[PDB]
């Protein structure tokens, strides 16, 4: 008695500034009736885009991004950054037997005060004339690596707002800094950051959001 796709109106999701393919896609709402206007029903969705499909690359085939809609104008709805993650299949394929897994997280507050928690993973490796077959670390190394990784994530987040942190996460610079600063301690292949997730978005401040797609 309805056929609901007679009344829903398409919109289109636009990425933020700090991405190449700014266009993302379309979405449905409902027609904007008086008594439940549409715009108050869009303003909390999160969208998952796999950032290859957002940066043209293909070595970014893992690392989904979550973008959150915060503003709407005239069949454009403008988004933000909600978090970042790996696809579960890469993560299942890193973790292997006969090696050890170092992981670390931290909670950190940015310049624009977004409180966010950021993860990090790393694995040891067999130095290229090692014959013995496993190469675990000695767990007094692992606390040194965990402290190093945590100090670098703490330092390198909060000297940035969010957009800067985002575009330090796309070219994977944090990986190279971890790698350099942690190879007198132990060899340590396969450094990543594997997740970041927001916990406190501060207060709205339209100025930043309309400064991204400006």
């Amino acid at each position: 008695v309805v056929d609901p796709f007679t009344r829903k109106e398409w919109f289109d999701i636009k990425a933020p500034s700090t991405f190449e393919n700014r266009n993302v896609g379309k979405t449905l709402v409902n027609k904007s009736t008086g008594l439940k206007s549409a715009s108050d029903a869009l303003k909390g969705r999160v969208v998952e885009v796999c950032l290859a499909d957002l940066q043209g690359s293909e070595d970014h085939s893992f690392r989904k991004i979550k973008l959150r809609v915060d503003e709407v104008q005239g069949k454009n709805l403008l988004t933000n950054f909600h978090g970042m993650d790996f696809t579960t299949d890469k993560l299942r394929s890193m973790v292997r037997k006969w090696q050890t897994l170092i992981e670390a997280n931290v909670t950190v507050k940015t310049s624009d005060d977004y409180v966010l928690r950021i993860f990090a993973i790393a694995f040891t490796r067999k130095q290229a004339n090692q014959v013995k077959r496993h190469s675990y670390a000695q767990s007094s190394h692992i606390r040194a690596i965990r402290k190093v990784i945590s100090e670098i994530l703490t330092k390198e987040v909060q000297g940035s707002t969010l957009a800067q942190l985002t575009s330090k996460l796309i070219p994977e610079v944090i990986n190279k800094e971890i790698e350099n600063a942690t190879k007198d301690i132990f060899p340590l292949q396969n450094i990543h950051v594997r997740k970041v997730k927001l916990l406190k978005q501060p207060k709205f401040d339209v100025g930043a959001l309309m400064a991204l797609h400006g």
Binding site: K26, V29, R45, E48, V69, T88
Partner: protein, 127 residues
């Protein structure tokens, strides 16, 4: 050019749900189960029932605007099996043979950093 939507394929023992939503996830455009397409209850989960399910969804969504899907396929997960059975892959096959464009297959079952008990007792459940 294209319009994309997501196709979430829950693949349980005793059914397969082919859901098709938008990117955002909230608005749904096409749910069919496997149960709507065979009235015998022998085989709600049979691959043939899954095929019929997926063909119906592909038709219905092609009648909306939607020409391509990313697929997210999942088994029960939790504290049961964690890998899609035959019902999910029969739905996937018969969805790719439909003129939809498929991109970015993944697999999201829920997997616990170890969790609560499993139904069944000390002696294992099914036999």
């Amino acid at each position: 050019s294209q319009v994309f939507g997501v196709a979430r394929i829950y693949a349980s023992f005793n059914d397969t749900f082919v859901h098709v939503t938008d990117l955002s996830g909230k608005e749904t455009i096409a749910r069919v189960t496997g149960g709507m397409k065979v009235k015998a209850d022998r085989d709600e989960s049979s691959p043939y029932a899954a095929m019929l399910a997926a063909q119906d969804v592909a038709a219905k969504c092609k009648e909306v605007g939607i020409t391509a899907v990313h697929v997210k396929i999942r088994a029960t997960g939790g504290t049961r099996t964690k890998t899609p059975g035959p019902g999910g892959q029969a739905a996937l096959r018969a969805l790719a043979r439909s003129g939809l464009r498929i991109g970015r297959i993944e697999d999201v079952t829920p997997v616990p950093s170890d969790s609560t008990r499993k139904k069944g007792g000390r002696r294992g459940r099914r036999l």
